[PDB]
Symmetry: C8
Subunit: 185 residues, 8 copies
Amino acid sequence: NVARPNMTLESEIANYQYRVGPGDVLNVTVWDHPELTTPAGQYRSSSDTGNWVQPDGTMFYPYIGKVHVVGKTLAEIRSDITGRLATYIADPQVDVNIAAFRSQKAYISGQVNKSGQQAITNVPLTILDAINAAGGLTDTADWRNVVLTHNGREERISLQALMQNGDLNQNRLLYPGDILYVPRN
Amino acid sequence: NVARPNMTLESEIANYQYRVGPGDVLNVTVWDHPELTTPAGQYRSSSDTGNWVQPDGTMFYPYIGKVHVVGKTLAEIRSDITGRLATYIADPQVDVNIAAFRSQKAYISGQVNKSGQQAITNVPLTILDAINAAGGLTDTADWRNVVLTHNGREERISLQALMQNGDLNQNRLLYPGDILYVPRN
Amino acid sequence: NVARPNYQYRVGPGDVLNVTVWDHPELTTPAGQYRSSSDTGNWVQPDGTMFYPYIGKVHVVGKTLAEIRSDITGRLATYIADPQVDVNIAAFRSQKAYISGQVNKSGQQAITNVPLTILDAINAAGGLTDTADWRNVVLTHNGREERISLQALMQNGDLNQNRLLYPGDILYVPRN
Amino acid sequence: NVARPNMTLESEIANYQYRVGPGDVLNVTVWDHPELTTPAGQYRSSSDTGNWVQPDGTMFYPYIGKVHVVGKTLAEIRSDITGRLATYIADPQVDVNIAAFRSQKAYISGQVNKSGQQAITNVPLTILDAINAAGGLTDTADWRNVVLTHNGREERISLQALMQNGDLNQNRLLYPGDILYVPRN
Amino acid sequence: NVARPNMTLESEIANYQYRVGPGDVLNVTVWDHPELTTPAGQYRSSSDTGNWVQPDGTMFYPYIGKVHVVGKTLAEIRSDITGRLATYIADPQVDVNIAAFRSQKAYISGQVNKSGQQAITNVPLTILDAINAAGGLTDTADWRNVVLTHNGREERISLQALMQNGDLNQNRLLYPGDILYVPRN
Amino acid sequence: NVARPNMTLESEIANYQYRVGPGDVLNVTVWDHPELTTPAGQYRSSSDTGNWVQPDGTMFYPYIGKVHVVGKTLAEIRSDITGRLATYIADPQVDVNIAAFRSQKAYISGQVNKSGQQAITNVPLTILDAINAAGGLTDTADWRNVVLTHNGREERISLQALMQNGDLNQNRLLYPGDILYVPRN
Amino acid sequence: NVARPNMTLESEIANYQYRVGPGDVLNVTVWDHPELTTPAGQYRSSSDTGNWVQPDGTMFYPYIGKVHVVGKTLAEIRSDITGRLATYIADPQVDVNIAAFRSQKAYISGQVNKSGQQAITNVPLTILDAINAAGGLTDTADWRNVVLTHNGREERISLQALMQNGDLNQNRLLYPGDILYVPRN
Amino acid sequence: NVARPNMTLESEIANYQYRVGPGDVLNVTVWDHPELTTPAGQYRSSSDTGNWVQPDGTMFYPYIGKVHVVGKTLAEIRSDITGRLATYIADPQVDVNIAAFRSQKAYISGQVNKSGQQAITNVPLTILDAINAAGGLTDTADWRNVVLTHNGREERISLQALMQNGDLNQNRLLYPGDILYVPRN
């Protein structure tokens, strides 16, 4: 055997867009307004000082009040906060990113060297990324019969074919809640 | 098998909300009022400088005095503090989050790679989350007969089914004081 | 074994306290804002007092944080109008329990403002070793020995095996 | 065992040019304008304060708005931003670099001492770089039959020739998405 | 096997009084006088900026000169320094604690998991404290026959009786110069 | 065999001169102008704030614009920059060093305790320096037949004589692109 | 043995007085003169900012010039410096301590757990201190026959008698240059 | 036999004097001139901000330009700098030390626990220092026939004699370039 690529995976990475979910910590920057950008000062990390997304899908932001952010992209949230701050600040220059990815994760467990949660973020997490992020497989992984649970199905995945034969069809884009289990040999 | 739907598990997790308990350390941000936000300076962390929730369920806040927070969400506390601070500050802009989740915890132990307490927080902690946060299982886990102690009942849980067949009915949301024990087989 | 569903710290000598006086950083952070609160906090003396500026010696041992907050506030009112004060503990040094034997991390565990039960302490010690005589754990409390089965606690959910640990308690997990 | 050059390797390294991709974190210096260079102050790292590249290929920048940066080099982005800031700022002195390389990566797994993703950056990553960055091969690497998966086809590489005899014909430039797999014998 | 109360051990611990020795590093706080409290600024640790006790028992303090501190309690040193500073500052508010306990120590050696010096401090150090601070005993510890050397006298101690039978008469307060030796089985 | 003095290998080092390559990060100090030396403040390290050398061999510098630095020594770049800054500041006092050596490197693998890339910097890196920098040989090194690939030609090297006989003849100066392989005994 | 005392050692520690050597780093505090106390600012450690003692036994100090310190005590040095600063500063309040003990050291090698040099400092270092500071002995230490080299003479020490029988006569004060070797059993 | 002192150990050490080499990083303190002492702020380390000695023997210093420092002592460099600064600053108070010893090094390989380079610094580094600086010998070390390569001549050294018997003639002072090899038993 040799290759068996997948430019169909080119697709879910093409339009890949993260959407904010509850428990995320947002970091809002208002240029020329350090009283807004760093209300607790400059030393603490943005995740220790950022805005928490509540379970009802909003975050509080000063002057404008509650802002619905769940299910929106960063650019939409940036656009929505900017337009509402315009009431209180003339021509606000605002950006928004995510200080802590907490709402969405995948579960990479089994015969990997580090098991555990991996966040879904603004960057695509494929099976390839998660296995390499979990630090590769142990010597005793059944790397021909990796189990991916996604939206109610199981799918068998052959990492062996992915890496030793370049069968890119074995790669998948991971979604919130997915389980990637590497059984023991 | 395949992944079987849980009418219970994903309705517990959309409605999922944390309520403050005694011993939590809260963090209160008052925009334009660094003398309230950071009375001890910008450099210490929010848990080293936050407001402790006392056994009686209150925390002290300056000017407004004792604030009853136990049993309330962050949004309910934000509103409570905002309305009371408005006596001393015109139109106060206030948010509240948690610097230290110390009041509520689940106990994850036995044949896990990292035994011990895991805090209950504003992010759901399911069995799947807790096992992954505990580093996964040891090679000698009786992982078909995990014991969940919850509300004075013992439930038996197959992590084998959850991760190798995708059986999401094997998942549970973990609650404060729950015990999740993984025996040796 | 069954399955059931269902605390005030008091300051002692050697505790390091941390007093916040809003709008008075000269009181809150006399040594600056970088050092941790335990490196700048007020030490509780053997006689049960701590020094606080302008008010002098404050008796704190045997009191709750709220009692110390109220005591300090009443007295600072002589020197500062309407003082806004809180007090918490930056180092829990006076009271502890001893968790030893076949646990993965043996040692002292602090008694704090948060209840520390047996269950808390064993998980805090990182669980039992594989050679723990875990059915016959010894708790020493107030001069009297007691038999604790963590087996029944975790294998069967028997919460009657749990106990709130107290200052001075010894929880010893033997080898079988 | 005599060493030789390479078609692929060296025609493409003197030209080597990184191009920004989505998810990268950019760092923009505007001399004499700390309100622009450091809106969140001076303590947090570049990647904690930098500008995120959005999935549509743009980044926001104050006053000049959205800026298309994907596919472009740092020098070009510096010129783009400089030209646009000149509307708002007299003679702006701008530089741009990358605080976090997150869009592009190679996968280096198998019998190397440190498996995992390696970022594609402004410095070339050749096979020789990537193996050394992984701490070399284990004692059990089939180091004459390494599998490079690039553009959907496999190529067998002899690290033994490369790393013991400096045969650069075995060295390749690694590209975003390449899998370099060291099988065990 | 009922637990035995120790005769004069909590009599000894309720009167427990640290007294300063040569080499201790003290920390003096003079409220409203940061020029005195933090002469080297407020970033270095109090032990990096503290006052050293000299062999002759004195420490230097600005304006008041050398102060005799060895043999005294913190509360006594505070009182001595305050009365002296009142010559140079009106109603000085002073506290004193110890940034480094360097003068006095016990030695905990043998079949414990962590051998070494243990500092004598304002907090009573009992055998039970020191053994627990050493991390417990190895499994080869002759733990029925521990040897306490104190003031030129040998004592046999049974940690086995202390920990498995709660015999608190086995516990002892440790003093400067004491040797606690845990032999091999 | 013998342990001789030296000739021409001394000028090779006494004339040793690093020259800047693409991807180096430079650090320019302008005394009395913290707005140029540290445009992003004083806390971030020089390599997080310094000036990247682009592929085309230049770095941008405020007010003087692009500056050719590849191939030049630090002293020459300092001269070049000073003369040009004199147009915007003058009697301008300027120094230049390298915050991150990223462009040039040697590769050290085999039976060393620490395979990997070693940077070529302003301090000469000899084989001995590389081997010691690589943690020392393993117990199973063929330290009589270490292979040095430099500019295509391969060369038997005997670390053995370099240390059990102090034969400085075997040692060599490492150059950018050099490979050094320590074979299994 | 019983814990028979060492009587000269009882009073040898009384006269214990460190004296400054070449290479030591001193830290001079001048209250009300942070330009003298912290000429490099408040952030770097004392040992990064201290005054080096030169090989001639002198150190430079601003305004007063060059100061003989070797062979002298901290309190002697403090008086020397205070008296000469009174020219340039009114009623100077001065203290001196060592930020880095680099000049004097004892060698603790052999069957100790952590072998290496141990600094001679203002705090006495006895054999008892040094071995405990070495975290104790290996299981194969001939702890009955430790060898102490001091001012040329040799001198047999029973750590066995010291620690298990309390024999303080086996303790000794370590001086600069002393070698203490725990033989193989 | 009789226990011997040494015939050169403490005049080579009593006259020991480091001299600056290329690649050293120097640290120049000008009291009352923070703009000269900390041009990059007070937070970065001395070695992150110090003055690099160029291969030609010189370092740049503001106002006075090139300063020849190689082969000079610290005291000499301090005078030279002071004198020329005096042209520009009224009576400058200057000290100089070394933030990074990068020019001169000894190599200690063989049956020591941590091989590698050891810098030559302002404090003497005898064999007795470098071994303990490597913690010490593996217990499989030919510690009777340790080879020291200095200035071309081999020479045999017995570390067993130095420590079992306190023979000081075995200990030697290490010079730049020296190689000290510990053979395996």
